[PDB]
């Protein structure tokens, strides 16, 4: 798909949740850091 006319991206505005974003061109993102991790079982 394309951005809404006159826009370069979409902001998905979220009580505790932060925003999600959508770009329609892959050149508008660079993968700076690769993070290797495990999720931790709570205490």
Q: Which does 14 bind (CB under 5 to 8 A by kind): ligand VJN, another protein, none?
A: another protein
Residue (19 or 43) nearer to ligand VJN, CB: 19
Nearest to 5 by CA among 29, 26, 24, 19: 24
CB 10 within 8 A of CB 20: no
Using CB under 6 A as the binding rule, whether residue 20 contacts ligand VJN is answered as yes
Angle at 38 between CA 29 and CA 21, to 5 degrees: 25
Report the nearest approach of ligand VJN to the CB of residue 20 (Å).
Answer: 4
Q: Which does 16 bind (CB under 5 to 8 A by kind): another protein, ligand VJN, none?
A: another protein
């Amino acid at each position: 798909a394309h951005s809404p006319p006159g826009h370069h991206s979409v902001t998905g505005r979220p009580g505790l949740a932060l925003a999600e974003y959508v770009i329609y061109r892959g050149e508008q993102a660079y993968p700076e850091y690769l993070i290797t991790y495990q999720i931790m079982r709570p205490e």
